[PDB]
């Protein structure tokens, strides 16, 4: 189930990060470090963490 949609492009600098393009559907699984979300980019099939404010909740 999709939980969020990316609002801004996020390109990893760190190997544990999830790349996001604008509009990407994301399933947010959990918060790791405060305001870091672990998610699944449903478009790319990748998993990783990203800064939480990059994603906006959607009904899915």
């Amino acid at each position: 189930e999709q939980t969020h949609r990316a609002v801004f492009r996020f390109i990893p600098r760190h190997p544990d990060e999830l790349e996001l393009d604008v509009d990407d559907p994301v399933l947010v699984e959990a918060e790791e470090d405060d305001f870091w979300f672990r998610g699944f980019n449903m478009r790319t099939g990748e998993r990783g963490v990203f800064p939480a404010f990059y994603a906006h909740a959607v009904p899915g």
């Binding site: 801004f8 390109i11 470090d33 305001f35 870091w36 800064p51 404010f53 990059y54």
Partner: protein
């Protein structure tokens, strides 16, 4: 000369990252094409990188 202000709370997960509280004054030294910025946090005196969306120009 402040260039930006932080608009989102950013807690570093990674060693190179700059912690941001909302409204922190920032001097952005490097905007990279991967949409990370490298800055001096003018409140905390720290330096590091943070995601471009988390700051706006003043």
């Amino acid at each position: 000369e402040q260039t930006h202000r932080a608009i989102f709370r950013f807690v570093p997960r990674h060693e190179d990252e700059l912690e941001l509280e909302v409204d922190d004054p920032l001097l952005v030294e490097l905007q990279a094409e991967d949409y990370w910025y490298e800055a001096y946090n003018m409140r905390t005196g720290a330096r590091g990188v943070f995601p471009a969306y988390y700051a706006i120009e003043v």
